[PDB]
Design a protein around this ligand. Structure first.
Ligand SMILES: CCCCCCCCCCCCCCCCCC(=O)OC[C@H](COP(=O)([O-])OCC(O)COP(=O)([O-])OC[C@@H](COC(=O)CCCCCCCCCCCCCCCCC)OC(=O)CCCCCCCCCCCCCCCCC)OC(=O)CCCCCCCCCCCCCCCCC
Ligand SMILES: CCCCCCCCCCCCCCCCCC(=O)OC[C@H](COP(=O)([O-])OCC(O)COP(=O)([O-])OC[C@@H](COC(=O)CCCCCCCCCCCCCCCCC)OC(=O)CCCCCCCCCCCCCCCCC)OC(=O)CCCCCCCCCCCCCCCCC
Ligand SMILES: CCCCCCCCCCCCCCCCCC(=O)OC[C@H](COP(=O)([O-])OC[C@H](O)COP(=O)([O-])OC[C@H](COC(=O)CCCCCCCCCCCCCCCCC)OC(=O)CCCCCCCCCCCCCCCCC)OC(=O)CCCCCCCCCCCCCCCCC
Ligand SMILES: CCCCCCCCCCCCCCCCCC(=O)OC[C@H](COP(=O)([O-])OCC[N+](C)(C)C)OC(=O)CCCCCCCCCCCCCCCCC
Ligand SMILES: CCCCCCCCCCCCCCCCCC(=O)OC[C@H](COP(=O)([O-])OCC[N+](C)(C)C)OC(=O)CCCCCCCCCCCCCCCCC
Ligand SMILES: CCCCCCCCCCCCCCCCCC(=O)OC[C@H](COP(=O)(O)OCCN)OC(=O)CCCCCCCCCCCCCCCCC
Ligand SMILES: CCCCCCCCCCCCCCCCCC(=O)OC[C@H](COP(=O)(O)OCCN)OC(=O)CCCCCCCCCCCCCCCCC
Lengths: 19, 27, 171, 120, 100, 50, 63, 459
């Protein structure tokens, strides 16, 4: 009902060495 | 099939209308 | 009112009331009732309003545009003069449009006013309408939405080349 | 381009001939935009250090606006000077070479033939 | 399990705590004055005075003038026997065509 | 003023209108100089528009 | 819904009725101007080329 | 134009120095005062445009889009204030600041005397709209739309930038007033063909074009209500305004370069209207309706007759008002049922009779009921395209069947039939919502009385 935000699943896509 | 043909058409029309890619500095 | 030359109305011919039957028509009684109940109070209120118009008489004026040089005698790419030429040409374009509208109003009023004999009795208005539509079409048709005095001059020059070639090929 | 011009008297921010040009007014809209950049700088300075943005350091915001207007005034003087030098060199080069800029004959549209393309 | 999360807030009803709510705000005085501002500066100001402004525009794009001017020019050229409109917009004497 | 915030936009209008008049004097190079509205000045008058 | 429609009609009529009464008083007492030829030497103002008084007011004040 | 830009900028200290319960009231009041001020632009002339300065001007094309733009801000502040109630105060002021900045960009986008200032303001309008859509869009799932925005930047605005710099070098100016008198015919060559595509494809995506409309039933769905209102009402019409400015320079090559894209629109409005008959999402249905109506504006600009420009600018103003009201009706149900599914909440005339009256009026303006200016624009475009080709009336009239068909279907599904049983949070209509519907509809109905102010520079 509220606004979507990044979960852990979305946030872990930008934590590695390369994209 | 698309981008190679469009690029070759651009090179053909650069031959025709005289399009310079490494253009000499004039001004 | 208006000007009876630009809006011509031929002289009205009404027939006299010729009562043949003894039964009184309702229309004369309703006309007298309309003349008493409706025409008189409206006319009195209009006279009051017209007295109040007379208590402050002030005027307005029809704006005049003196003729500036047209696009033919303006230099190429000289915007100070061809701007004036374009403003003159656009004012003449809108005025030519209203001339065509006046001739259309004449033709429609002639058709209704003549009724069933409209084809016989409105030949002159139809002739004037054909001439003014031919003139307006030769002057302003097919210019496009980005019309200008240059487009109109080029259309006039192409038409004059066609007329000169048609004159030459006839001899 | 103009680097041979400011090579006879190098490292002059404003030369002497720049004093023959009208300086910008203090109500120059360019200089007013530079003062607004100073006010924005003061607000960002209070924002990044968690101060009240519109309240804290009014002397500091005043020095931000003052310092940006002060630097921008001389920057606008040099800007106006360099465009004046560009036009001076342009006009003196056109005057010193009349053969390269011929007075091309002005034809009115009564002689100019343009092709009419009808929209139909 | 998954992370520490605040739960989904339920949709509030503005009619419960204020049955005279116009929906502008939950504070009733703010709500009623928001209603008065929207209705006055929307309807009493922009629509009414705006339609009054547009209705009495001083000859928007000189249409009426252009009719009355036409009522001059037709009267000038009905009387002098001229045609009502020439087929050429400009004078054909001041035009130089390309020869062939 | 207790209602000093309701004059931000309206004075911001008038000042804006002020600057519009301020730009009109910078565009008066053809005031009474066009070929359409050139005329002699009436008595007690210095410009045709401001 | 009825509260909205009452408020809609009220806030429309709030300046509708003074505007209609004022336009009526202008058309009755101040009244419609008359067409006239431009005199010799009299150059009219730009707002003096229009007929209705509210149009003259708009062309004089704002335009 | 500086009597409009400066009050729009003074809405920034008005929105940041206002008390926390007063920031909607103050911005709504002063933006309504700016919208009342916006009628001074009606000083238009039958020959000359209203030319303020070296930087700003206004003919009768830009003037109604300016009035609609300055009118759209109070309506967006009304529409977007409910679902920002639990928002932070500073984030709420950031939302209002992005709306004000978008209006500030638009009102000097439409008045741009010179075309590269038009380009700067034109591509400046995307950034506050982007931030409004992606910070307050309530869900963001844009895996396919990133590549499409890359396609918009590649095929669109950058060739327009290179083309405008080329005209700046060739003509010596990009002042539209100078380009009225220094325009050269653009003849048939391959250089001029890529010149035409560079001058047109940015505005083709902004309309949008059929086949290029892939962004619009996504960006309308993933947006807040103010973002969808400004996308439907104004931000599509930048493409039509830019086409009507840039087709001055593209003659006479337009007379044979329009033929593909005209087909893309004449068939395209047959498809997208038909697409509206199979929409589960109501907001997507209104998006595809916006595509189906801007296809006619694309055709009317490309055929460049007077009747087509008059119909196209009347259709732009009318569709701005109408589709903005349709998105506001879609939100006035979404704020209750919390889902955009059009088959979820049915039979709403049993529950909300006045709101169903607003649905009926917005549907009748959507399907071009005369004498509304939707029909005036629709009709004049249809007349001009009949003058273009006498067969196109079929593709017009068939569209004018399907445009009716989804307009009442949207009325019949949402408002008629049996009410949904398991939905019991259907509140009565707030006075804010009905005021929003009336401030859409009543200007749209009053413009039927005097349509001559929305028929463009060649009325
Ligand atoms: C002015 C413009 C620049 C202002 C920067 C600072 C703004 C700020 O701090 O605002 C807060 C402040 C009020 O806040 P506060 O209560 O003091 O405390 C803040 C809280 O702590 C904040 O609460 P919080 O931090 O705890 O939590 C909320 C959170 C919420 O944060 C979020 O939700 C994250 C962000 C959400 C997404 C992004 C939203 C949009 C922001 C970016 C802007 C993009 C569009 C810009 C254009 C396109 C380019 C990208 O963070 C904030 O809100 C942070 C505060 C700052 C917000 C605003 C920042 C604006 C900077 C960017 C714009 C300017 C630079 C780029 C311009 C480009 C070209 C135009 O507001 C102002 O100060 C606004 C100005 C009001 C007065 C105007 C007076 C005008 C006077 C004119 C005459 C004077 C000059 C004369 C010149 C001539 C002299 C001779
Ligand atoms: C009324 C209040 C209602 C409630 C208030 C709220 C109203 C709504 C709020 C509106 C807010 C403003 C919005 C913007 C509009 C502004 C006004 C405007 O632009 O007006 C335009 C337009 C132009 O007027 P103008 O430019 O001011 O003046 C023109 C003249 O050049 C110059 O004018 P003039 O000097 O030639 O005329 C002066 C006129 C004053 O000027 C006006 O009245 C004009 C201002 C009125 C505007 C009203 C607009 C509001 C909406 C009206 C329509 C809806 C009303 C509600 C529903 C009604 C039922 C449906 O003087 C009079 O009226 C006095 C004569 C009265 C005659 C009747 C009585 C005579 C006998 C009396 C006997 C008793 C006394 C005897 C003893 C006497 C002793 C001395 O005015 C009108 O349209 C007036 C309305 C009436 C038009 C004719 C109505 C009948 C037409 C029938 C055929 C066509 C339709 C066929 C339909 C077929 C079926 C579908
Ligand atoms: C500048 C001054 C001008 C003065 C004159 C006014 C000019 C037009 C202004 C706007 C007209 C519409 C206003 C009402 C509709 C919106 C609100 C609404 O739904 O109210 C329902 C409500 C009555 O219903 P209710 O039972 O109480 O509650 C709702 C029900 O629960 C549930 O509702 P329902 O289902 O039971 O009933 C809804 C029903 C449903 O009926 C329909 O859907 C049938 C309509 C379509 C077929 C019939 C019309 C076809 C076209 C022919 C007529 C037009 C040309 C005539 C000319 C001669 C021939 C060419 O709609 C109506 O009865 C509305 C009547 C008017 C309809 C106009 C056409 C709408 C169709 C779409 C556009 C068509 C082309 C554009 C037309 C433009 C006209 C100027 O009305 C009110 O409470 C009235 C509120 C105040 C209205 C003020 C109007 C003026 C606003 C402008 C302010 C600024 C100027 C100052 C003038 C002030 C004058 C007082
Ligand atoms: C414009 C671009 C942006 C678009 C969005 C705008 C939003 C902001 C809104 C700002 C304010 C509104 C601006 C537009 C205003 C348009 C209206 C307007 O000014 O009109 C001028 C028109 C002008 O008419 P006119 O053209 O004849 O004017 C003649 C000129 N004067 C007045 C100087 C002599 O006003 C009227 O027509 C008023 C006439 C009297 C009232 C109407 C009487 C009849 C009404 C219908 C009766 C019932 C019929 C049957 C119904 C059956 C059921 C359906
Ligand atoms: C949209 C799809 C097409 C975009 C093309 C790229 C922008 C071109 C902008 C206009 C430039 C121009 O003046 O073109 C004429 C010029 C003509 O060269 P010119 O103008 O320097 O030549 C002198 C003048 N004539 C022609 C008389 C000799 O075109 C070009 O130089 C090349 C144009 C095509 C560009 C190819 C690279 C991009 C390919 C598409 C990417 C998307
Ligand atoms: C901030 C500004 C601070 C300026 C300090 C003084 C700088 C100065 O006077 O520099 C001299 C220089 C002009 O000297 P000149 O030799 O003509 O430069 C050729 C450069 N290619 O003038 C300049 O280089 C002026 C421009 C300096 C801009 C620096 C910040 C950007
Ligand atoms: C995909 C997304 C959804 C759809 C959006 C639109 C995408 C495509 C946009 C371009 C549409 C097609 C191109 C425009 C067609 C205009 C007429 C034309 O070019 O006809 C084909 C041409 C005929 O030859 P002719 O026109 O005489 O060429 C000499 C020109 N002086 O034929 C030829 O010359 C032969 C072919 C040569 C290659 C042309 C490549 C350039 C055009 C496409 C880019």
């Amino acid at each position: 009902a509220r606004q979507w935000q990044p979960d852990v699943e979305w946030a872990e896509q930008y934590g590695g060495a390369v994209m | 099939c698309a981008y190679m043909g469009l690029t070759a058409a651009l090179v053909k029309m650069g031959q025709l209308e005289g399009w310079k890619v490494f253009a000499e500095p004039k001004v | 009112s208006w000007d009876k030359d630009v809006y011509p109305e031929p002289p009205r011919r009404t027939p006299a009331p010729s009562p043949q039957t003894s039964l009184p028509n309702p229309i004369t009684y309703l006309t007298k009732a309309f003349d008493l109940l409706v025409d008189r109070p409206v006319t009195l209120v209009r006279e009051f309003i017209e007295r109040q118009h007379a208590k402050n008489k002030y005027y307005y004026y029809h704006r005049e545009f003196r003729r500036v040089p047209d696009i033919t005698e303006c230099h190429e790419k000289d915007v100070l003069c061809m701007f004036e030429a374009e403003m003159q040409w656009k004012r003449d374009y809108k005025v030519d449009q209203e001339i065509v509208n006046i001739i259309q109003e004449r033709l429609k009023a002639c058709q209704q006013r003549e009724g069933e004999s409209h084809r016989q009795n409105c030949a002159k208005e139809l002739q004037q309408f054909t001439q003014v539509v031919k003139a307006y079409q030769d002057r302003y048709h097919d210019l496009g939405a980005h019309y200008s005095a240059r487009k109109c001059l080029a259309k006039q020059k192409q038409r004059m080349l066609a007329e000169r070639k048609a004159t030459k090929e006839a001899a | 381009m103009m680097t041979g011009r400011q090579a006879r008297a190098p490292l002059q921010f404003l030369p002497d001939e720049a004093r023959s040009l009208p300086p910008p007014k203090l109500t120059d809209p360019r200089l007013a935009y530079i003062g607004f950049l100073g006010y924005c700088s003061g607000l960002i300075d209070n924002a990044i250090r968690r101060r009240p943005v519109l309240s804290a350091g009014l002397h500091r915001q005043f020095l931000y606006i003052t310092s940006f207007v002060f630097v921008g005034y001389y920057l606008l003087k040099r800007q106006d000077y360099m465009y004046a030098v560009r036009d001076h060199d342009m006009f003196s080069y056109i005057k010193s070479h009349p053969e390269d800029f011929p007075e091309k004959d002005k034809k009115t549209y009564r002689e100019v033939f343009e092709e009419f393309h009808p929209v139909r | 399990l998954r992370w520490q999360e605040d739960p989904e807030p339920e949709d509030e009803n503005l009619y419960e705590k204020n049955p005279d709510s116009h929906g502008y705000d939950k504070d009733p005085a703010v709500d009623v004055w928001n209603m008065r501002v929207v209705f006055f500066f929307g309807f009493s100001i922009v629509l009414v005075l705006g339609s009054t402004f547009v209705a009495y525009l001083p000859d928007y794009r000189m249409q009426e003038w252009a009719r009355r001017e036409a009522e001059r020019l037709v009267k000038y050229r009905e009387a002098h026997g001229l045609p009502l409109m020439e087929s050429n917009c400009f004078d054909p004497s001041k035009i130089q065509l390309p020869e062939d | 003023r207790d209602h000093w915030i309701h004059v931000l936009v309206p004075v911001g209008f008038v000042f804006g209108y002020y600057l519009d008049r301020k730009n009109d004097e910078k565009l008066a190079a053809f005031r009474n100089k066009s070929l359409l509205y050139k005329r002699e000045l009436k008595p007690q008058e210095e410009v045709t528009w401001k | 819904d009825k509260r909205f429609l009452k408020l809609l009609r009220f806030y429309i009529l709030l300046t509708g009725i003074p505007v209609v009464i004022g336009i009526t008083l202008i058309n009755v007492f101040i009244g419609e101007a008359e067409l006239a030829e431009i005199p010799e030497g009299y150059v009219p103002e730009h707002w003096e080329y229009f007929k209705h008084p509210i149009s003259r007011w708009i062309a004089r004040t704002f335009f | 134009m500086l009597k409009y830009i400066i009050p729009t900028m003074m809405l920034m200290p008005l929105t940041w120095l206002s008390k926390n319960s007063m920031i909607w009231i103050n911005t709504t009041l002063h933006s309504l005062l700016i919208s009342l001020t916006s009628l001074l632009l009606l000083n238009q002339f039958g020959d000359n445009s209203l030319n303020f300065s070296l930087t700003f001007f206004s003919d009768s094309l830009s003037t109604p889009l300016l009035i609609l733009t300055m009118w759209l801000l109070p309506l967006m502040l009304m529409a977007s204030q409910h679902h920002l109630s639990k928002e932070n105060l500073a984030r709420k002021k950031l939302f209002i600041s992005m709306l004000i900045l978008l209006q500030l960009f638009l009102i000097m986008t439409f008045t741009a005397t010179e075309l590269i200032f038009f380009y700067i303001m034109f591509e400046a309008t995307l950034v506050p709209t982007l931030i409004i859509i992606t910070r307050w869009g309530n869900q963001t799932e844009r895996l396919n739309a990133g590549l499409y925005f890359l396609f918009y930047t590649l095929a669109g605005s950058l060739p327009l930038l290179v083309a405008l710099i080329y005209i700046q070098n060739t003509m010596g100016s990009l002042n539209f007033l100078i380009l009225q008198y220094w325009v050269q015919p653009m003849p048939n060559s391959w250089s001029n063909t890529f010149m035409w595509l560079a001058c047109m494809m940015a505005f083709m995506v902004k309309m949008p074009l059929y086949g290029l409309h892939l962004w619009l039933p996504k960006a309308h769905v993933e947006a807040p209500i103010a973002g969808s209102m400004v996308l439907a009402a104004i931000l599509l019409k930048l493409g039509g305004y830019g086409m009507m400015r840039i087709t001055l320079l593209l003659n006479p090559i337009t007379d044979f370069m329009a033929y593909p894209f005209i087909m893309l629109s004449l068939w395209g409005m047959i498809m997208t209207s038909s697409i509206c008959l199979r929409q589960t999402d109501l907001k997507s249905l209104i998006a595809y309706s916006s595509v189906s109506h801007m296809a006619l504006v694309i055709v009317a600009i490309l055929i460049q007759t007077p009747w087509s420009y008059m119909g196209a600018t009347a259709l732009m103003i009318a569709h701005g008002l109408t589709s903005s009201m349709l998105f506001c009706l879609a939100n006035s149900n979404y704020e209750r049922v919390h889902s955009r599914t059009m088959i979820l909440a049915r039979g709403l005339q049993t529950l909300l009779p006045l709101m169903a009256a607003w649905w009926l009026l917005a549907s009748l303006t959507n399907l071009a009921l005369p004498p509304s200016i939707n029909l005036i624009g629709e009709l004049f475009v249809v007349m001009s395209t009949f003058s273009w080709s006498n067969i196109t009336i079929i593709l017009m009239g068939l569209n004018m069947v399907i445009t009716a068909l989804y307009s009442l279907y949207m009325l019949i599904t949402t408002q008629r039939g049996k009410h949904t049983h398991h939905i019991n949070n259907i509140l009565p209509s707030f006075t804010r919502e009905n005021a929003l519907m009336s401030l859409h509809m009543l200007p749209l109905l009053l413009l039927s009385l005097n349509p001559k102010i929305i028929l463009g520079p060649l009325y």
